[PDB]
Amino acid sequence: KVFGRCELAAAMKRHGLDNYRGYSLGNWVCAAKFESNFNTQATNRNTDGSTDYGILQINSRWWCNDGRTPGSRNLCNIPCSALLSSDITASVNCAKKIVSDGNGMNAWVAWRNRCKGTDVQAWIRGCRL
């Protein structure tokens, strides 16, 4: 499912991401835009053999199991395929664990390079929240 900007903001807000760990809603929507272009079915394989899944491109090396990333962890306790669902619940719950890990949202390099320090509030402007 390809989400609309405001449609995703509302879905994330409903799942408790607004201000989660001090990160305003604009930050999460911006991260999703550049990580997957709002597409829940997005996947990208990395040089180390791991693969990123879903709207927030969560990595298989540590957070989910895809059965093909040798010596990987499954800290979110979910099959990676569950992160490609049109229902973002699984992605959201796992993202909350990731952002609490220690480096905050810096864990997402697209956020660090394209959202961090910018006017992220622009990502939710015009939305009925």
XYZ file of N, CA and C in Angstrom:
387
model
N 0.836 -1.236 0.000
C 0.000 0.000 0.000
C 0.855 1.264 0.000
N 0.539 2.181 -0.907
C 1.254 3.444 -0.976
C 0.385 4.450 -0.236
N 0.895 4.947 0.885
C 0.170 5.909 1.702
C 0.226 7.326 1.170
N -0.766 8.117 1.561
C -0.777 9.514 1.184
C -0.051 10.168 2.345
N 0.459 11.379 2.154
C 1.178 12.069 3.218
C 0.354 12.195 4.503
N -0.803 12.847 4.408
C -1.661 13.041 5.573
C -2.253 11.735 6.090
N -2.533 10.802 5.187
C -3.093 9.519 5.591
C -2.113 8.785 6.507
N -0.828 8.861 6.176
C 0.190 8.200 6.980
C 0.390 8.918 8.310
N 0.400 10.247 8.272
C 0.578 11.022 9.490
C -0.508 10.645 10.500
N -1.742 10.516 10.025
C -2.858 10.165 10.900
C -2.683 8.756 11.447
N -2.272 7.834 10.589
C -2.071 6.462 11.023
C -0.973 6.383 12.083
N 0.126 7.107 11.872
C 1.226 7.093 12.833
C 0.808 7.720 14.161
N 0.075 8.830 14.082
C -0.394 9.530 15.274
C -1.254 8.593 16.109
N -2.158 7.886 15.439
C -3.057 6.943 16.092
C -2.286 5.817 16.786
N -1.122 5.463 16.245
C -0.319 4.400 16.840
C 0.675 4.893 17.880
N 0.546 6.160 18.268
C 1.411 6.720 19.292
C 2.812 7.193 18.945
N 3.103 7.433 17.670
C 4.434 7.901 17.291
C 4.657 9.398 17.475
N 3.587 10.186 17.521
C 3.762 11.625 17.698
C 4.410 11.907 19.045
N 5.606 12.488 18.999
C 6.382 12.820 20.189
C 6.982 11.615 20.903
N 6.956 10.449 20.260
C 7.528 9.255 20.875
C 9.032 9.460 21.043
N 9.493 9.446 22.291
C 10.909 9.646 22.598
C 11.366 11.031 22.170
N 10.440 11.981 22.165
C 10.793 13.340 21.800
C 10.810 13.666 20.320
N 10.412 12.720 19.475
C 10.392 12.954 18.030
C 8.993 13.281 17.548
N 8.804 14.522 17.103
C 7.507 14.982 16.605
C 7.087 14.209 15.358
N 5.782 14.161 15.123
C 5.219 13.444 13.988
C 5.910 13.755 12.664
N 6.212 15.028 12.431
C 6.875 15.407 11.195
C 8.122 14.584 10.904
N 8.875 14.241 11.948
C 10.101 13.455 11.796
C 9.846 12.056 11.232
N 8.818 11.384 11.745
C 8.487 10.031 11.296
C 7.954 9.993 9.875
N 7.173 10.999 9.499
C 6.619 11.035 8.151
C 7.734 11.322 7.164
N 8.646 12.207 7.549
C 9.776 12.549 6.693
C 10.660 11.316 6.477
N 10.844 10.536 7.535
C 11.671 9.339 7.459
C 11.040 8.321 6.522
N 9.723 8.170 6.608
C 9.023 7.221 5.756
C 9.076 7.649 4.294
N 8.941 8.949 4.040
C 8.971 9.452 2.675
C 10.263 9.056 1.972
N 11.392 9.383 2.588
C 12.685 9.087 1.995
C 13.213 7.668 2.144
N 12.672 6.903 3.085
C 13.119 5.524 3.240
C 12.391 4.619 2.241
N 11.097 4.853 2.046
C 10.308 3.994 1.165
C 9.336 4.693 0.216
N 9.315 6.018 0.248
C 8.399 6.793 -0.578
C 6.965 6.405 -0.214
N 6.743 6.189 1.077
C 5.434 5.823 1.608
C 4.898 4.486 1.104
N 5.775 3.605 0.625
C 5.341 2.300 0.110
C 5.630 1.176 1.111
N 4.571 0.554 1.633
C 4.728 -0.519 2.611
C 5.422 -1.765 2.063
N 5.427 -1.927 0.745
C 6.038 -3.111 0.145
C 7.494 -2.924 -0.271
N 8.081 -1.795 0.097
C 9.463 -1.528 -0.277
C 10.483 -2.463 0.379
N 11.429 -2.939 -0.427
C 12.505 -3.797 0.052
C 13.798 -3.377 -0.638
N 14.915 -3.543 0.058
C 16.224 -3.208 -0.497
C 17.288 -4.068 0.166
N 18.044 -4.818 -0.635
C 19.089 -5.685 -0.091
C 20.378 -4.877 0.062
N 21.118 -5.156 1.132
C 22.369 -4.459 1.417
C 23.568 -5.337 1.064
N 24.753 -4.738 1.009
C 25.963 -5.482 0.658
C 26.299 -6.592 1.643
N 25.913 -6.419 2.904
C 26.204 -7.423 3.920
C 25.242 -8.612 3.888
N 24.353 -8.642 2.898
C 23.412 -9.746 2.790
C 22.083 -9.533 3.494
N 21.991 -8.481 4.307
C 20.754 -8.179 5.021
C 19.807 -7.424 4.084
N 18.541 -7.329 4.471
C 17.549 -6.649 3.645
C 16.701 -5.703 4.498
N 16.337 -4.550 3.938
C 15.505 -3.573 4.650
C 14.057 -3.762 4.196
N 13.118 -3.750 5.143
C 11.709 -3.982 4.824
C 10.692 -2.937 5.262
N 9.708 -2.703 4.400
C 8.626 -1.800 4.734
C 8.793 -0.300 4.648
N 7.750 0.367 5.121
C 7.644 1.809 5.131
C 8.813 2.500 5.841
N 9.367 1.855 6.870
C 10.504 2.422 7.601
C 11.811 1.654 7.367
N 11.816 0.793 6.352
C 13.001 0.020 5.984
C 13.774 -0.555 7.167
N 13.105 -1.397 7.940
C 13.717 -2.025 9.098
C 14.602 -3.189 8.647
N 15.841 -3.189 9.133
C 16.852 -4.178 8.761
C 16.739 -5.584 9.370
N 16.997 -6.596 8.540
C 16.921 -8.003 8.948
C 18.102 -8.494 9.789
N 19.198 -7.745 9.796
C 20.374 -8.135 10.575
C 20.067 -8.179 12.071
N 19.233 -7.250 12.537
C 18.915 -7.184 13.958
C 17.454 -7.247 14.375
N 16.563 -6.701 13.557
C 15.165 -6.596 13.955
C 14.085 -7.579 13.531
N 14.272 -8.282 12.424
C 13.259 -9.242 11.988
C 13.917 -10.443 11.330
N 13.160 -11.526 11.195
C 13.686 -12.734 10.586
C 13.176 -12.938 9.168
N 14.090 -13.082 8.211
C 13.679 -13.325 6.834
C 14.258 -14.650 6.344
N 14.815 -15.410 7.280
C 15.377 -16.713 6.971
C 16.592 -16.775 6.069
N 17.163 -15.628 5.711
C 18.333 -15.636 4.841
C 19.449 -14.690 5.268
N 19.442 -14.272 6.529
C 20.478 -13.371 7.027
C 21.219 -14.105 8.143
N 22.174 -14.973 7.773
C 22.971 -15.758 8.722
C 23.513 -14.988 9.929
N 23.345 -15.569 11.113
C 23.834 -14.934 12.322
C 23.160 -13.611 12.622
N 21.877 -13.510 12.294
C 21.134 -12.287 12.551
C 20.266 -12.443 13.795
N 19.790 -11.313 14.303
C 18.937 -11.294 15.479
C 17.518 -11.000 15.012
N 16.550 -11.236 15.885
C 15.152 -10.974 15.577
C 14.600 -10.279 16.814
N 15.188 -9.128 17.126
C 14.814 -8.353 18.304
C 13.362 -7.919 18.373
N 12.710 -7.789 17.222
C 11.309 -7.397 17.222
C 10.399 -8.615 17.254
N 10.999 -9.799 17.155
C 10.244 -11.047 17.218
C 9.146 -11.153 16.178
N 9.492 -10.857 14.933
C 8.520 -10.924 13.859
C 9.168 -11.286 12.542
N 8.392 -11.925 11.652
C 8.956 -12.281 10.347
C 9.032 -10.953 9.602
N 10.099 -10.742 8.842
C 10.242 -9.489 8.112
C 9.052 -9.198 7.195
N 8.455 -10.247 6.633
C 7.313 -10.085 5.732
C 6.163 -9.345 6.405
N 6.092 -9.449 7.723
C 5.031 -8.789 8.463
C 5.159 -7.269 8.373
N 6.343 -6.796 7.997
C 6.617 -5.363 7.884
C 6.194 -4.752 6.548
N 5.679 -5.582 5.647
C 5.257 -5.109 4.333
C 3.734 -5.020 4.229
N 3.052 -5.334 5.322
C 1.593 -5.290 5.365
C 1.036 -3.881 5.156
N -0.208 -3.782 4.700
C -0.830 -2.469 4.524
C -1.179 -1.900 5.899
N -1.129 -2.746 6.926
C -1.407 -2.338 8.314
C -0.013 -2.062 8.881
N 0.264 -0.809 9.239
C 1.590 -0.431 9.745
C 1.887 -0.746 11.205
N 0.934 -1.360 11.896
C 1.116 -1.697 13.303
C 2.461 -2.361 13.611
N 2.767 -3.446 12.907
C 4.013 -4.168 13.126
C 5.233 -3.273 12.929
N 5.226 -2.468 11.873
C 6.349 -1.575 11.608
C 6.506 -0.563 12.734
N 5.388 0.011 13.158
C 5.389 0.995 14.226
C 5.902 0.438 15.549
N 5.402 -0.725 15.955
C 5.846 -1.305 17.215
C 7.340 -1.590 17.203
N 7.848 -2.041 16.064
C 9.266 -2.358 15.955
C 10.117 -1.088 15.925
N 9.612 -0.057 15.257
C 10.321 1.211 15.173
C 10.481 1.799 16.577
N 9.464 1.629 17.417
C 9.526 2.147 18.782
C 10.669 1.491 19.550
N 10.918 0.215 19.286
C 11.999 -0.475 19.977
C 13.337 0.039 19.450
N 13.414 0.215 18.136
C 14.630 0.696 17.489
C 15.042 2.085 17.976
N 14.092 3.017 17.986
C 14.373 4.389 18.398
C 14.720 4.521 19.883
N 14.395 3.497 20.670
C 14.688 3.503 22.103
C 16.051 2.855 22.371
N 16.614 2.240 21.333
C 17.889 1.527 21.395
C 19.094 2.327 21.890
N 19.179 3.601 21.522
C 20.309 4.400 21.962
C 20.662 5.565 21.055
N 20.682 5.336 19.743
C 21.011 6.400 18.796
C 19.804 7.143 18.255
N 18.647 6.879 18.847
C 17.435 7.548 18.424
C 17.126 7.307 16.965
N 16.636 8.340 16.291
C 16.287 8.212 14.883
C 17.484 8.196 13.943
N 18.681 8.386 14.490
C 19.884 8.354 13.667
C 20.043 6.959 13.068
N 19.310 5.990 13.620
C 19.340 4.610 13.131
C 18.884 4.541 11.672
N 18.075 5.509 11.261
C 17.598 5.584 9.886
C 18.505 6.601 9.187
N 19.376 6.147 8.294
C 20.273 7.079 7.624
C 19.591 8.088 6.692
N 18.373 7.811 6.219
C 17.709 8.782 5.344
C 17.188 9.937 6.194
N 16.837 9.639 7.440
C 16.350 10.658 8.364
C 17.537 11.532 8.742
N 18.647 10.883 9.067
C 19.853 11.589 9.458
C 20.348 12.516 8.342
N 20.293 12.046 7.098
C 20.769 12.840 5.965
C 19.764 13.749 5.280
N 18.477 13.474 5.440
C 17.489 14.284 4.744
C 16.375 14.915 5.565
N 16.272 14.544 6.839
C 15.233 15.092 7.713
C 15.799 15.851 8.901
N 16.791 15.256 9.554
C 17.425 15.862 10.721
C 17.839 17.306 10.450
N 17.411 18.208 11.330
C 17.751 19.616 11.201
C 16.943 20.423 10.203
N 15.983 19.790 9.544
C 15.168 20.497 8.568
C 13.829 20.819 9.205
N 12.991 21.569 8.498
C 11.675 21.911 9.029
C 10.732 20.739 8.781
N 10.834 19.718 9.624
C 10.005 18.530 9.485
C 8.514 18.796 9.687
N 8.179 19.924 10.307
C 6.777 20.257 10.540
C 6.056 20.401 9.199
N 6.819 20.714 8.161
C 6.260 20.875 6.828
C 5.599 19.589 6.331
N 6.030 18.448 6.864
C 5.479 17.168 6.435
C 4.066 16.867 6.918
N 3.583 17.640 7.879
C 2.235 17.422 8.377
C 1.352 18.648 8.189
N 1.890 19.688 7.557
C 1.111 20.901 7.335
C -0.055 20.620 6.399
N -1.205 21.214 6.702
C -2.382 21.012 5.877
C -3.164 19.763 6.230
N -2.591 18.919 7.083
C -3.253 17.683 7.490
C -4.241 17.901 8.629
N -5.350 17.169 8.596
C -6.354 17.263 9.649
C -5.952 16.252 10.718
N -5.305 16.736 11.773
C -4.843 15.885 12.866
C -5.510 16.234 14.195
